[PDB]
Amino acid sequence: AITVNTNVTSLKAQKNLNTSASDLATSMERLSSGLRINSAKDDAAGLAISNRLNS
Amino acid sequence: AITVNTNVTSLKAQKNLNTSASDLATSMERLSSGLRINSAKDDAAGLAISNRLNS
Amino acid sequence: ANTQANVADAKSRIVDVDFAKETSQMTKNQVLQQTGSAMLAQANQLPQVALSLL
Amino acid sequence: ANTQANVADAKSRIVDVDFAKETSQMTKNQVLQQTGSAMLAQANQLPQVALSLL
Incomplete structure (x- = not known):
């Protein structure tokens, strides 16, 4: 048509x-940031693992 | 006539x-898409083969 | 977004006009109007044979 | 600074126009204007069948 x-x-x-x-x-x-994980939209378990490694 | x-x-x-x-x-x-197979109208066996390769 | 595109396609198949078909119908009826006008104008001159017989 | 960025994003989702959609609507209405103009100009010539009958 x-x-x-x-x-x-x-x-x-x-x-x-x-x-x-x-x-x-x-x-x-x-x-611009230099990071793969800028939010929890990106990777949620890696966020917590990296918080503990940072501590 | x-x-x-x-x-x-x-x-x-x-x-x-x-x-x-x-x-x-x-x-x-x-x-516009960049893909040959946008549906199963296009190629049905290639769709499944490509799903497995994607996995 | 996917579903909106497919449903708008579906609705267009039902509601919208086809230009290729409708222009053809228009031209056909134009020609028929001119022919019918000519034929009616020629038809209104039939009672004049009586004046010849008279 | 974080909150300002996120709130400006939120406001843009509500207030700003979409160019990809709005240009499409503009082109559609352009074509409809040309078609409607042609159809009205053709419509104003209908009372001339009477001159043929007359």
Whole structure:
């Protein structure tokens, strides 16, 4: 069909572009900080193990 | 015959144009994603082989 | 996000118009209008055979 | 400093526009404007069948 009111290819392209931008921002943060684990989003058990090793 | 009520050339042109548009949309998706297999419509055995290699 | 894309596709298949088909129907009805107008204008001149017989 | 960063992120999620979505909506309405203009210009020519009947 040739339709004007809905465009699905654009929706899917938007979602892919957003995923790529998120990944790039995460990498930029990790290079700026120098650490792999900046939150518990990253690795939760490693966070606690590293707190104990830090103590 | 010279008829007004039915136009078959138009029907066939419509079907060809729809086929071309579908192919173009598929290609656009594949270039936006970076992957050949976006669904199981594409390659079903390769999907499972790649899931195992990913594991 | 995935499901929204697929459901909007599904709805578009039901609600939206097809331009390739609808333009063809429009042109067909245009030609039929011109033909029917000509034929009605020619049809309103039939009672004039009586003036010839008269 | 931490909290300022997180709260500005939170506010941006609510207030700011999405360019990827909004440009798509703009292009859709552009095409619809051109189609509706053509269709209205074609619609204003319908009373001319009477001149043919007349």
